[PDB]
């Protein structure tokens, strides 16, 4: 009679290595060789127990075989582990305003999908709730792109992976905000001022809470300046750093959300006395 | 109102949810878990938070963002799954020595534990085919093949998943199922029948033990004279496994077998030998 197939009883991986112990015919050679063809060989203790640590190997595919001392084997033990946690992020090329911050006006933003074994069958996203194919570009990475423009607002978004011997993992999520969003703001002189001011208060108003750039374009006789509005505690502020000339002046504020959403106010031509 | 926060990295570390995201800068950042705890923080200024809360049950919490005035965000409900399942063979169904994971049980039950309480699937992959695991009267999940087993191999794989459709497997366990033991035998020793019909004139004869699989890890012999059977240890010695009586045998007849037992728990006894002992010398 063979000996019998050997036991695995406890099996982790730590860094990269497999580590597991169990059990076998005592004093038997045991042989693990893996997908990349190396052999790992032990003599199994006189207790019929057995423990070992092998570098993780290609798609996590390796065997464990009992030869006793008259070269008689066991069954084959195949084994087909997984490893690695799917990634997903925004594409950098689909991210618009600052890059990295998850937020972007693109409505159809591409989600780049990375750490994957070459044994991985099924590649699919959950976005909000509902899971779909991810696919499979020229050059054999994945990516997701949604199939029509996303309505603004929270996605949520997770990766998930599986191989042939259905060992399948998914990311803890991130969330993407879509805001292609942005309320046409307005410049007009503030509540107590044509005026007597040489530095005149302006009121900014529509500005949505999503705003982080404001500023002022002020133009007079061919030459437009640009100046940084001041936000507060109450909103978004502007009265000139200096004196003013007297004159007509034209006036429009035009303002940037995190996003990268713009809007220009409607024109103001006013008159220093 | 503010636009819903953002998470761009979330991470379990040592029971802590970890995350960073965006957010309205200036406001506030409202953490609420399934547990009832609020966790609060200011977002800086460049829009910027990082945050880490303790793992409330079933993963599931929900980020706000609410500013100066009381403005608030869409909520964004999270639920997130921390635990890989774990399975054992049942020591009920280990036979032999306990914990080796080596059964002569052909439809041996497996007990499921490490799931969290949002858990909706639970599976059991077991060399390459997925079951349901089924709920016992404690609550407790288990999983117990429906035909029995054949002996060899069996690579068993747990796998839950909660209501998000966060779903984890277990590394693989292997169990052996061995319900098969060669029948061993009993006979005098080369020289001990002294022609061939198993009347020997030593008194304590040697026996040779043969036909022993090599997962025998119990063997004694049988002896029954006068109606009494005795049990003696046997020895595995130079020429193999072995057997002599402790003390001299008075003259007659006595009747062994060999029971062998192996690492599984199955257990078998050899056909019974007859033997006559005969040191008598016949006087004239
Ligand atoms: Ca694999
Ligand atoms: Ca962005
Ligand atoms: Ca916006
Ligand atoms: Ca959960
Ligand atoms: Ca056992
Ligand atoms: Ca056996
Ligand atoms: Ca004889």
Known sequence: TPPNAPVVTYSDI?????????????????????????????????????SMAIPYPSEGKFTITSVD???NRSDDVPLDIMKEVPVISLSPDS??????????????PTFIIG????????????????????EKNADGVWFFTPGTPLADGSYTISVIASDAAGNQKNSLPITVTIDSTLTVPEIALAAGEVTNHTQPKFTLQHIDADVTGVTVNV???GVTDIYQATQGAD?????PPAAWNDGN??????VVDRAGNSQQSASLAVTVD
């Open 14 to 50: 730590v860094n990269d290595l497999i580590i597991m112990q169990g059990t076998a015919e005592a004093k038997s050679q045991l042989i693990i060789t893996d997908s990349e063809g190396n052999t790992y060989t032990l003599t199994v203790p006189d207790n019929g127990k057995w």
């Open 235 to 239: 909103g978004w502020t502007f009265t």
């Open 219 to 221: 133009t007079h006789n």
């Open 115 to 134: 750490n994957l074994e070459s044994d991985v069958v099924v590649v699919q996203v959950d976005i909000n709730g509902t899971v779909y194919n991810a």
């Open 249 to 254: 002046y034209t006036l429009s504020v035009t």
């Open 95 to 108: 991210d618009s305003g600052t890059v990295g911050d998850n937020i972007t006006r693109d409505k159809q």
């Open 69 to 71: 001392a008259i070269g």
